[PDB]
Amino acid sequence: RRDFLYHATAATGVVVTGAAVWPLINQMNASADVKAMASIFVDVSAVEVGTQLTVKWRGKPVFIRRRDEKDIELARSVPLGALRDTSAENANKPGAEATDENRTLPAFDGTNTGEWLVMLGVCTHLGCVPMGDKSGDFGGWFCPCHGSHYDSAGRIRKGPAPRNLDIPVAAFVDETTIKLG
Amino acid sequence: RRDFLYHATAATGVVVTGAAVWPLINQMNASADVKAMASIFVDVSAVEVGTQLTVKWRGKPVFIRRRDEKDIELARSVPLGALRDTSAENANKPGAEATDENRTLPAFDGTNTGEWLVMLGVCTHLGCVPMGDKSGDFGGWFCPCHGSHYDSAGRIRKGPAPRNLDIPVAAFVDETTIKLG
Amino acid sequence: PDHAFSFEGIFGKYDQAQLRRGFQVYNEVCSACHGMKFVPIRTLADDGGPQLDPTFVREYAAGLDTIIDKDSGEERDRKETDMFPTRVGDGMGPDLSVMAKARGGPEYIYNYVIGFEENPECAPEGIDGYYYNKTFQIGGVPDTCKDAAGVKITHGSWARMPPPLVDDQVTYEDGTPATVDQMAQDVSAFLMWAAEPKLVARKQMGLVAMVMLGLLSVMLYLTNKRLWAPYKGHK
Amino acid sequence: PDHAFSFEGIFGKYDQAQLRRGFQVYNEVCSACHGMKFVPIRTLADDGGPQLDPTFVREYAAGLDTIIDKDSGEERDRKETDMFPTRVGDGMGPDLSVMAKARGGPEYIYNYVIGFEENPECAPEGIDGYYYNKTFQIGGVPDTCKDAAGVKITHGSWARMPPPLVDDQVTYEDGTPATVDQMAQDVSAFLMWAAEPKLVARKQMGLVAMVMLGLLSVMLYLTNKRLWAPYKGHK
Amino acid sequence: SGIPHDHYEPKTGIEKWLHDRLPIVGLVYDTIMIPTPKNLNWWWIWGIVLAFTLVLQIVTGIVLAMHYTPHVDLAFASVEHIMRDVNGGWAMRYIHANGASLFFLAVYIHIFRGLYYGSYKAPREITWIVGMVIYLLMMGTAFMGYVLPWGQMSFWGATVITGLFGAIPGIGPSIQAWLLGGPAVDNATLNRFFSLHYLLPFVIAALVAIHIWAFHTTGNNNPTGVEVRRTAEKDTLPFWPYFVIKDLFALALVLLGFFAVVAYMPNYLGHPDNYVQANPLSTPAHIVPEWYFLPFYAILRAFAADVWVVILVDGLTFGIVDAKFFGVIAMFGAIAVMALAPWLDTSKVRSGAYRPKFRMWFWFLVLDFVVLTWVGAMPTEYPYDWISLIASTYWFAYFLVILPLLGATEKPEPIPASIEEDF
Amino acid sequence: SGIPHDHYEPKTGIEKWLHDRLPIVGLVYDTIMIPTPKNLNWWWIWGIVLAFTLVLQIVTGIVLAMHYTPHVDLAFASVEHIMRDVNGGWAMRYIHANGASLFFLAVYIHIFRGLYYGSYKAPREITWIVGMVIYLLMMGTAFMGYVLPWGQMSFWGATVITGLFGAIPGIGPSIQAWLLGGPAVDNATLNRFFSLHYLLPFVIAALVAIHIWAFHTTGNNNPTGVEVRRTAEKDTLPFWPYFVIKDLFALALVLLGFFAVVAYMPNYLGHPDNYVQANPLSTPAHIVPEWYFLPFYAILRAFAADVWVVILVDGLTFGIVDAKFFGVIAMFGAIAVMALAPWLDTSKVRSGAYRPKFRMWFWFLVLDFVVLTWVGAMPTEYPYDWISLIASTYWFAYFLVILPLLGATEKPEPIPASIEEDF
Ligand code: HEC
Ligand code: HEC
Ligand code: HEC
Numbered sequence A, B: 001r002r003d004f005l006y007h008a009t010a011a012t013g014v015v016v017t018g019a020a021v022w023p024l025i026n027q028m029n030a031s032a033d034v035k036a037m038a039s040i041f042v043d044v045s046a047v048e049v050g051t052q053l054t055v056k057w058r059g060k061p062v063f064i065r066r067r068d069e070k071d072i073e074l075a076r077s078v079p080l081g082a083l084r085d086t087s088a089e090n091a092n093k094p095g096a097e098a099t100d101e102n103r104t105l106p107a108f109d110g111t112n113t114g115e116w117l118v119m120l121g122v123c124t125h126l127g128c129v130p131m132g133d134k135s136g137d138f139g140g141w142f143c144p145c146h147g148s149h150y151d152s153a154g155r156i157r158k159g160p161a162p163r164n165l166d167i168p169v170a171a172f173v174d175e176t177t178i179k180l181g
Numbered sequence C, D: 001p002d003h004a005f006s007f008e009g010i011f012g013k014y015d016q017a018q019l020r021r022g023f024q025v026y027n028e029v030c031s032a033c034h035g036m037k038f039v040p041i042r043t044l045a046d047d048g049g050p051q052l053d054p055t056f057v058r059e060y061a062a063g064l065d066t067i068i069d070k071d072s073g074e075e076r077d078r079k080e081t082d083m084f085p086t087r088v089g090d091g092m093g094p095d096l097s098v099m100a101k102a103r104g105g106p107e108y109i110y111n112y113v114i115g116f117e118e119n120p121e122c123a124p125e126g127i128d129g130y131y132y133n134k135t136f137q138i139g140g141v142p143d144t145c146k147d148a149a150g151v152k153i154t155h156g157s158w159a160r161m162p163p164p165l166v167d168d169q170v171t172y173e174d175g176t177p178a179t180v181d182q183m184a185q186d187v188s189a190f191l192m193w194a195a196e197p198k199l200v201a202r203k204q205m206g207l208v209a210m211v212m213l214g215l216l217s218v219m220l221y222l223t224n225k226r227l228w229a230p231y232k233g234h235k
Numbered sequence E, F: 001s002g003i004p005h006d007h008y009e010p011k012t013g014i015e016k017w018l019h020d021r022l023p024i025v026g027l028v029y030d031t032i033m034i035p036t037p038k039n040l041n042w043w044w045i046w047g048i049v050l051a052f053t054l055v056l057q058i059v060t061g062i063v064l065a066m067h068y069t070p071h072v073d074l075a076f077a078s079v080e081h082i083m084r085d086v087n088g089g090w091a092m093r094y095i096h097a098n099g100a101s102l103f104f105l106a107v108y109i110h111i112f113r114g115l116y117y118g119s120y121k122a123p124r125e126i127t128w129i130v131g132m133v134i135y136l137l138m139m140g141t142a143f144m145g146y147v148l149p150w151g152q153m154s155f156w157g158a159t160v161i162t163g164l165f166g167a168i169p170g171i172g173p174s175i176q177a178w179l180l181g182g183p184a185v186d187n188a189t190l191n192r193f194f195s196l197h198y199l200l201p202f203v204i205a206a207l208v209a210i211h212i213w214a215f216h217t218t219g220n221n222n223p224t225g226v227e228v229r230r231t232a233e234k235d236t237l238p239f240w241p242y243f244v245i246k247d248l249f250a251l252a253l254v255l256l257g258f259f260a261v262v263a264y265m266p267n268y269l270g271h272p273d274n275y276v277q278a279n280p281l282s283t284p285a286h287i288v289p290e291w292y293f294l295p296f297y298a299i300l301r302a303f304a305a306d307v308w309v310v311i312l313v314d315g316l317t318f319g320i321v322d323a324k325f326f327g328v329i330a331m332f333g334a335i336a337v338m339a340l341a342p343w344l345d346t347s348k349v350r351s352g353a354y355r356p357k358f359r360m361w362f363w364f365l366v367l368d369f370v371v372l373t374w375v376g377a378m379p380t381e382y383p384y385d386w387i388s389l390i391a392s393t394y395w396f397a398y399f400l401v402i403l404p405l406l407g408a409t410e411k412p413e414p415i416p417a418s419i420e421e422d423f
C-alpha cells in the first residue's frame, strides 16, 4: 500500500541514518586508553609535617597535607551548623556527617585522626586548584577563579562552591606510604 | 584628474595587496632551522672493506663503499664513449671527465684511489634510493622506482636517470674518518 | 592442506586458546629479540582475544623490563597502561606489532618459521652468521646460487634470524602436543591479534550493515517499480 | 629616572654591545641554575642582536653540557643546531626563554635583580633557606609582617633565589665599570632578546605599513570627496 | 523600484556565451549595484570590516597550521618555532591573535548600531537570528583557539568553561566527559579543539552567505524609520563605487590602527601567564579568561546568594535549580533575550533617533556593557558583587520590560518622510 | 517550457513570511523539481554517488583529525591509537581510505559516461571545465593524504611526485624546496599536507556548487542527441521523487558492496609496506604509488629514449627539453587535451549511440585506460615499455586527431527525434 510502503521506506532510512550517526558521537567519548584510570602509591616519607604535599593522578592533583595544631583546633571547633556542605564528601566511608573525626583520615593503621588529611585539590565549583599554605578568610584554601573560601578540613565556605573538597578512597601502607585508588 | 587619481588609487591598492601576499608565499620556504645544513664526521673504522656503508645527513643517505677488485676492473675498463654522463658530478673537483681516477675519491691523505668511493645515494631521476650490494645489469646499483642501472663507479646507465651519482665535498681525517661537508 | 586458520573467512572470531598458546610462546621465545610497542598490556583482558585475568596481567607486566617515565626520569614498575617493551639493536629484530599486515599475512609467518632447513646442494658451506630460510625472499644469496643475470635459484634466501624452536621447546598447560607446527600456527594467530584486535567486531558490523542495506534497497526497489508503473505498462 | 632601555619606544634596535655584555653575564652567572631551551644557539649570529662570530658560537656550544640525541642514545658533541641546556630541579629555577613577556617586563627583572637588601625591622631573623626581595610579589611572608587580614606590609616578599651578583663579579672586555646595575640592565636586555628577537623587523614593518596605508587612505578620501561632490554642493 | 538592471547580457559575444553560467549576472545585478540610501552615516561600514577580518583570520590560520603541532608536548615549542624561525611568524600570530580582538570589537559596534536604528524590527528578523547564531559560533571558535598554545591560561579557561556544562544535573558529567575526551583536560581535548577550530570558520562564511542574501532581499536599514519608497526612486544611489569606496577608506584607517597596534602594542590585550607552560598542579591568580567574555563571566559569577536581591534563595524552592545552574541559565538567557528582542519591542516605530526615552535607556545599556566588561576582571569581594548584580538586572530589565513600555508610550516625535533628506 | 513552478508562496502564512529569505523557493523551484528526461539509464546516478562519497570523506576526516597528530614521531602512533583504542576507529579509517577508491572509481564512470553521450559537446563546456578542475583538486588531495600515516610508501611517493616539479629547468629546485618546506621531506611537508588536505574538500564543495548550478541552467544530457523541446513538454518528468528514488536505490546497492569490502576486504586495495614505519635510508621494491595515478605514472615513465618511436631523441633538438621534462609535459597534456576536447570534436552531432566508428574508438580508449592502469605497476623492462608507449600514443591520438576526422565523415546513422521514446 501507498502509505505503508512510503512510510516504511522513510523509517528504514531514518534508522540507518541514526545507526551511522551514533558512532560519530561515540568516538568523542573516553577511549580505552583513558578507561584505565587506576591507583598511585605516594610516600609521605618525612616531608616536614605541616606544610603540604601534592601529587598528580588521574590528571588532577591529590593534596596530602599534615595538620598544624592551630589549624586542627579551628577545625574541631566547627559545629555542623553554619556549614554549607555537611556530607563529608570522603568516599572511603558512608554519608556520615562532615565531622573532623570522620573527615581527617584513617589512622596510619593505628588510632589517631587529627594529623593527616588527603583530599582531591579540585574546587567543586568548576574544577580550579585552590591555593594552599594557609590562605583565605578561614585559615585554609582559597580558590582564585571565583573566590571560594575553604576551611581547615576542606569544607566549603564563603563562596559559590556548593560542596567541600572530596576525599578519595585511600588507606595506609604501615606508617610510611599512601595508597590512592 | 579623473584618470590619474583613479588609476593611482588602483595601483596603490595593487602594490599593498602584493606586499601582503608575498609573505604568505615566503613562509613556505626553508626556515632558519633548515638553513643550518652543515657537515658530518663518519668513521670508516674497519667495516669490512667491500660491502657498503650508509649514513644519514641533510635528510639523505651518503654512501661510503669500499671497492672490490672485480668491481674496480669493471670500472677502470669503461671508456668515456657510451657513458651517458661524462661530467664526474663530484663537487670536490672541477668538471673533469667522469673518469675512475678522478671519480673514486681522495687518497686517505696518501696516494691511491681505487679503494673507496663515497657518493650521494640519491637517484638523479627523481630522488629515490638505489639498492646496493651488487645489483642491476652492470654490477652496481639499481633504482627500483623506475629501473635505472648504475655502474660500479656510480655513473648512470640503462635508464631515464640523466646523470650519475654526485659526489659531495669530502676529505679524509688521516686514515680513519670521513668529513662530509 | 593450506592449514587455514579460524578467522580466515566471514566468521572465525579468534579461537582464544590458540592465542593463549601463542602468548606462552611469544613471551618465552620471540620476546628475547622482538618487541610489540604498538601493543598495550591491558589488551590481554579486552574481549575478542585472550580474555586473561587482569591480576595475571598486572603480575606479568611488573615482571617485564623497566620503562622509566615521561615526566620524572626514574625506573618505574612498568604498569600495564604502558606498552610492551622494544628490542631495538645489537642482534635484534623489528617490531611484530603489525607484521601480520606488512606482508596472506599470517601464512607468511607460518611458512617462514616453518622452514630453516640445511643449506642446499649448491652452497652447503653457506655463510658465517647468516642462516637459511625456505620462504624469506628479501635476503642475500651467494653468487654460487644466482643465475646468469643475478636472479636466485633458491626458493627463499638467507635470513639473519636463527631457528626459533626445536622439537619440544615448551609445555602447554591445557595439554597438547607442542610440536613446532602447532607453535607456529599459534604464534601466527597471536600476531594477527596484535595487529587486528577488532576483527570480530568488523565481521559483525559487516553482517548487520549488509542486512540493513539489503532491506533498504529492496524497499526502494519496490517503491521505484511502483512509481514508474504507469509509464512502463503499455510497452 | 626610570632607566629606560634602548628598545623602549618606536625605535631602538637592540644596542648589541649591551647584549654581548648580558651574554657574558648569563653564561657565567645565571646559567648555573637557569636555562633557555626555547633558544637555539645559532641565533647568536642572526642579525638584530649579538652578531657574534659563528666559529665562537660553535666553540661555546661544544663547551656546554651534553645533549644526547633523538635517534641513537649517545652523548654527542652538542652542535649549535641544538638548543641551550635546561636546569630543571634540585635547587634550580625556571626557564628564562620568555620570562621577559610573562611579567613592563624587563623592568621587572632589573628591579628584581636590583633589590635583595637585608631583612627589614619586622622580622630581622628572616627565614632559613629563603632570602628577601623588595619586588618579587609571589613569595611567602612571615606572620609577623602580615596585617590583620593576611595582606603583607612589605613591598616585596621572600624569593628562593639568592643574590646573584656582588660589587664586581665579572670583567667586561670592551672596558666598562661592571657594577651590579649595569650588569642587571645588560642581562635584562639579553633576556628580552631571547624572548623577542624579531623586534626591529616588527618596528620596520610597522613603519612601512603605516606609511603605505596612510597613502592609500588619503587617495581613497580624495576619491570619495570627488564622487560625492555633485550631491553635497548645494547644502 | 528595486531596479536590478540585469545588464541584459548585451555587452558582446563573451557576455552572451556566459548564458551557460549566469555568475556575472548575479554579481552585477545584485551584489554590486544594490540600491542603497544616501542617508548612511559611518556606522554602516563595520560589516565590510568583519568580512575582511574573517578572511584575514582564515588566511593567517591556514598558514599557522603549517607549523602548529597539536600535542601537549609540542604545541608551545611549535609556537616558538613560528615566532622565531619562520619567515613572517610573529606577524601571522600577532595578526591572528589581535584580529580576533578587532573582530569582536567590530561585531559589538555592528550589533549596537542595530539596536539603535531598529534593524531588528520587522521585516529584518532573519538577519538578526542569523547574526546571533554567528556570534555563538565565533565565540566558541575563539574559545577553542585560545587553548591551542597550551599555555597556562588556556588550561584553566578550558577547565572552567567546561565545568559549566557539568554544573547542570543528570547530564552534566556525561557531556563534560564527552567534550573533554575524558575526565579532565589533556591532548584529546586539544585535538578536538584544533579540528573544530579549523572547521567552524567555513560554517561562519556560509552563514555570512545567508546573512548577505537576507539584507539584499530586505533593504538596508537607513538612519530613519523609512524605506526606499519602491514605486523611480531618485534616492538610493547604488553600492558601487560610492559606498564601496567609503567603506574601503574606513577600512584602510582601521587596518592602519590595527597594524600600529600589532607592531607597537601587540602583547597589550593578552595575558602574560599564557607565555608559561602549563602546570595542572598550580593555578595562577586572576585567570581572567579574556575580554570578549567578561560580560557573561560576570553575569555567571554574580548570582551567589549574597544579596537581599538574591533570587537564588527563592529559586531553591525546587531542589534541582541550585546557584551554578541558575547562573548558566542566566547567561544563556542574556543571549536568548537579545535574540528574542524583535518580538518584544511592541512599537510600530523605528530608529531611536525619534524616541528619546529609548535613547537614554540605550546609552545606559552601553554603559552597562562597559561596566560588565570591567567587572569580570575584578574579584567577587564587596562592592563589585552589588555592581555586577545591578548591571545584569538592568540588562534583563531593558530587554524584557523596557521595550514594551516604550512601544506603548513612546511617540512624542515627528517622524521624517522622504528618505531623500536634502537638508 | 522549463517550468520552474515557484509555488507562488501560496501555502500559508509560514510560506508567506518566508518572503524574507527565499531559501525554500530556491530548493523547490529549482533543485528538486528540475525537469529531467525519461530516457535516463543507470549511468546518470554516479553524481549522487560522488556527492555522498564526498560528504562521507569529509565527515570521517573531521573525526580522524581529532586523533591524528601531524608529526614524524607521533603520526603512526596516532593512527594505531585510532585503530585500537577509539570507539569506531578502524571503521572511520577503512571508510576514509577505501571511500577515496570508490570516489575515483565513480568519477571514472562519471567521466567516461560523459565522453560517450557528448556531454562535453556544446552547450555544456563550463561543466566540463569545472569537472577537470575538480579532478585536479581531488587528485592533489588524495596525494597529500596518502602521506599523513608516515608509513614507508608515503615518504617515497612524496619524494618522486615532488621531484617531478624539480625536473623542469630554472625554477624546478626552487619550487621543490618551497613545496617540501626544505631540501627533502620532513615534518614541515607533513604539516603543509595536513592543512592543505584538511582545506581543499571545501573548495571542491563550492566547485560542486558551480557544477550543480551549471547543469541545472543547462539541461541534463540524455541518452539522445536531443533536448527537452522547450516550447508543454509532456516529456521531462521531474527529479523528485522518481529519479531521487532511483539514485538512492543504486546508492544503497553501492554502499552495500562498499561496506562488504570494508568488513572483509579492507586491506586489499592498499600497500602493505605502508604499515612499516619510514626509513629515509632504505627504499622498498615496487613503490607502486597507488591505483588512481598509474595511468599518468606510466605516461611519465614511458618516454625514455628506448624505442624507434622515441621522440625524445628528436625533442633533444632544444637542449633544454630533456626526457624528464618531456614526460611531465606529456602527463600535463594528457589531462589538458581531455579538457580541450569540446573544442576538438568538430561534429554537429551528439551521443555515439549513433556514431559507430566512435563506438569502436571509444571502447579502445577504455581498454587503453585499463591497460595503463595495469602497466604502471609492472617494471620498465621489455615488453612493457612498448605497451606503455603504444597506449599513451593512442590516448593522445584519439583526443587530438580521431575526433576531427569523425566529425568530418561520421554520419551514417538516423538520429532519433521526440525525446519521448515510447518504444
Ligand atoms: C633473536 C635470537 C631472535 C629471536 C629469538 C626471534 N627473532 Fe625473529 N628476527 C630476528 C632478526 C635478527 C630478524 C631480521 C631477519 C633479517 O634477515 O632481516 C628477524 C625477523 C623476523 C621476522 C621478519 C621476517 C621478514 O620477512 O622480514 C619475523 C616474522 C620473525 N622474525 C618472527 C619471529 C617469531 C615468531 C619469533 C618467536 C617464535 C622470533 N622471530 C624469534 C631475531 C630473532
Ligand atoms: C641558583 C643559585 C640561581 C642562580 C645563580 C640564578 N637564579 Fe634566578 N631563580 C632561582 C630560583 C630557585 C628561582 C625561583 C624563585 C622563587 O621564589 O620561586 C629564580 C627565579 C628567578 C626569576 C623569576 C622571578 C619571578 O618573579 O618568578 C628571575 C627573573 C630570575 N631568577 C633571574 C635571574 C638572573 C637574571 C640570574 C643571573 C644574573 C639568575 N636568576 C641567577 C635560582 C637562581
Ligand atoms: C586554518 C586554521 C585557523 C583558522 C581558520 C582560525 N584560526 Fe585561530 N588559531 C589557529 C592556530 C594554529 C592557532 C594556534 C597558534 C596561535 O595561537 O597563533 C590559533 C589560535 C587562536 C587564538 C589564540 C591566539 C594565541 O596566540 O593565543 C585565538 C583567540 C583564535 N585562534 C581565534 C580565532 C578566530 C575567532 C577565528 C575565526 C573566526 C580563527 N581563530 C580562525 C588556526 C586558525
Ligand code: HEC
Pocket (backbone or CB within 6 Å): E043, E044, E045, E046, E047, E048, E050, E051, E054, E107, E110, E111, E114, E119, E120, E124, E127, E128, E130, E131, E132, E134, E135, E208, E211, E215, E218, E219, E220, E221, E222
Ligand atoms: C547579532 C547580530 C549580527 C551579527 C553578529 C552580524 N550581523 Fe551583519 N547585520 C546585522 C543586522 C541587523 C544588519 C542590518 C541589515 C539591514 O540593515 O538590512 C546587518 C548588516 C550587515 C551588512 C550590510 C550593512 C552593514 O551594516 O554593513 C553586512 C556587510 C554584514 N552585516 C556583515 C556581517 C558579517 C561579515 C558578520 C560576521 C562575520 C556579521 N555581519 C555579523 C546583524 C548581525
Ligand code: HEC
Pocket (backbone or CB within 6 Å): F057, F058, F059, F060, F061, F062, F063, F064, F065, F068, F079, F092, F093, F096, F097, F100, F103, F138, F141, F142, F145, F146, F147, F148, F149, F197, F198, F201, F204
Ligand atoms: C577533516 C579532515 C579530512 C578530510 C576532509 C579528508 N581527509 Fe583524508 N585523511 C585525513 C586524515 C586525518 C588522514 C590520516 C589518517 C588516515 O590515514 O586514515 C587522511 C588520510 C587520507 C588518505 C590515506 C589513507 C590511509 O590510511 O593511508 C587518503 C587516500 C585520503 N586521506 C584521501 C582523502 C580525499 C580524496 C578526501 C576528499 C576529497 C579526504 N581524504 C578528505 C583527514 C581528512
Ligand code: HEC
Pocket (backbone or CB within 6 Å): F043, F044, F045, F046, F047, F048, F050, F051, F054, F107, F110, F111, F114, F119, F120, F124, F127, F128, F130, F131, F132, F134, F135, F208, F211, F215, F218, F219, F220, F221, F222
Ligand atoms: C571531468 C569531468 C567531471 C567531473 C570530475 C565531475 N563531473 Fe559531474 N558532470 C560532468 C558532466 C559533463 C556532467 C553532465 C551534465 C549534463 O548532462 O548537463 C555532469 C553531471 C553531474 C550531475 C548531474 C547528472 C549526473 O550525471 O548525475 C551531478 C549530480 C554531478 N555531475 C556531480 C558531480 C560531483 C559531486 C562531482 C565530484 C565530487 C563530479 N560531478 C565530478 C562532469 C564532471
Ligand code: FES
Pocket (backbone or CB within 6 Å): A123, A124, A125, A126, A127, A128, A129, A143, A144, A145, A146, A147, A148, A159, A161, E160
Ligand atoms: S572554580 Fe573554584 S571557585 Fe570558581
Ligand code: FES
Pocket (backbone or CB within 6 Å): B123, B124, B125, B126, B127, B128, B129, B143, B145, B146, B147, B148, B159, B161, F160
Ligand atoms: S627515481 Fe631513481 S630512477 Fe626513477
